Design a protein around this ligand. Structure first.
Ligand code: ST9
Ligand code: ST9
Lengths: 188, 190
């Protein structure tokens, strides 16, 4: 529909120009819709940014949630999380620019709305960690919140570095090396 | 004169933290420092010059102090323990600093970001030094991807701070130093 056409054109425009520099009129023209047609679907530019993130994250979570059911151990569940995270962003370079640079807004009001959407993804990491402790696979007395922040922070930094290096190298191929580091640490 | 230069730097930290980088005009920084707009322009080209120099100055001082301190530590674990505790302590000691590092320095403009990341190299090279020495010591096992390990360490420390800033500093960040250390050292597996 026209809705997804605007969403996709927004991903391209925001990635290319930056969020604040982006023009709603330009997003419309690239989507192939009239200027007024965008406002039938979105309140403003902020609504566009939040909705595209909510949408894509919403798709990513529901795929992830059912996919990790097939995997028994916490290590296997985390392996899939990392490879899927890396795979989605490697498949479309515009997406990585949005996630690593453009969604990193400093305005408290806007950033809280962004981080609210992030919560669903981090919740999956929490579940993997809590059930891992239950089985005795994951360290007992380990802080789930801190481990969640290590896992996400590590994955995120790997992506950011890749983005800053013009995405010239294979991000997906780093999946297993990242997993082992998070599993056994630097001492190993 | 450097004292005036650094006075502007310190005034800018407060302004950028309290106002946000977008609303951090030269005139506001001037008013904070208690100097005329012209005085600022004798030391800096513009708002962007101040932000980069701000980061260069404070990171430089952090690195120098860090290089100094870790000389007293023996193992890579102890060296990393110190890096983590000092990183947390600096940002916990002045919340204005943490706002600048976790939010305000996170610029979307690729050209500005590249200049910021250039200053970040010196910090990451200390982590590289700790790891490469650790491999050549037997403390860290062979075949460790240094780059990825560095990215893991910084990413973990950085995300822990950001979460703390986003939760309005409502917990003891420095007290988490050892827990973060053990997670990086031993991982999540039992
Ligand atoms: C208030 C005042 C401030 C107080 C400050 C004092 C307090 C200090 C503590 C606070 C610190 C917090 C920092 C503040 C915020 C900074 C900005 C952020 O957002 S930070 C958070 C976000 N993070 C960031 O923004 C940091 C993102 N990272 C970077 O931008 C860069 O890694 C770099 C510039 C940091 C280093 O660059 P470089 O020296 O070049 O090293 P590279 O490894 O990148 O590249 C080497 C070559 O190898 C290739 N290669 C690399 N990796 C891999 C791999 N895994 N597999 C295969 N290949 C790989 C690569 O293609 C390249 O190839 P080529 O070019 O030779 O062909
Ligand atoms: C466009 C395409 C999209 C692609 C599709 C997506 C799939 C692939 C992409 C992957 C996603 C990439 C993300 C891209 C978006 C960029 C956004 C970033 O900047 S991300 C990079 C930067 N990262 C960020 O910006 C994320 C920063 N984190 C946060 O802002 C939050 O953790 C949260 C909102 C995520 C969750 O919040 P919440 O659910 O509230 O859970 P909390 O634990 O935080 O709070 C619970 C309570 O516990 C307290 N407490 C916490 N720790 C401790 C402790 N150690 N001791 C004692 N107490 C502690 C705390 O004070 C709080 O107090 P209260 O509530 O009782 O008063």
């Amino acid at each position: 529909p026209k809705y997804m056409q605007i969403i996709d054109a927004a991903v391209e425009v925001i990635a290319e120009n930056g969020y604040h520099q982006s023009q709603v009129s330009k997003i419309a023209k690239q989507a192939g819709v009239a200027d007024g047609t965008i406002y039938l679907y979105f309140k403003n530019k902020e609504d566009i940014l939040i909705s595209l993130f909510k949408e894509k994250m919403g798709q990513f979570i529901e795929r992830m949630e059912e996919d990790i059911k097939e995997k028994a151990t916490a290590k296997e569940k985390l392996a899939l999380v990392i490879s899927k995270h890396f795979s989605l962003l490697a498949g479309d370079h515009n997406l990585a620019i949005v996630t690593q640079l453009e969604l990193r807004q400093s305005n408290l009001e806007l950033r809280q709305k962004i981080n609210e959407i992030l919560k669903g993804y981090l919740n999956i990491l929490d579940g993997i960690l809590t059930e891992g402790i239950q089985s005795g696979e994951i360290k007992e007395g380990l802080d789930v919140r801190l481990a969640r922040q290590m896992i996400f922070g590590t994955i995120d930094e790997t992506v950011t570095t890749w983005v800053m290096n013009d995405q010239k190298y294979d991000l997906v191929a780093l999946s297993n090396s990242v997993l082992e580091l998070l599993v056994s640490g630097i001492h190993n």
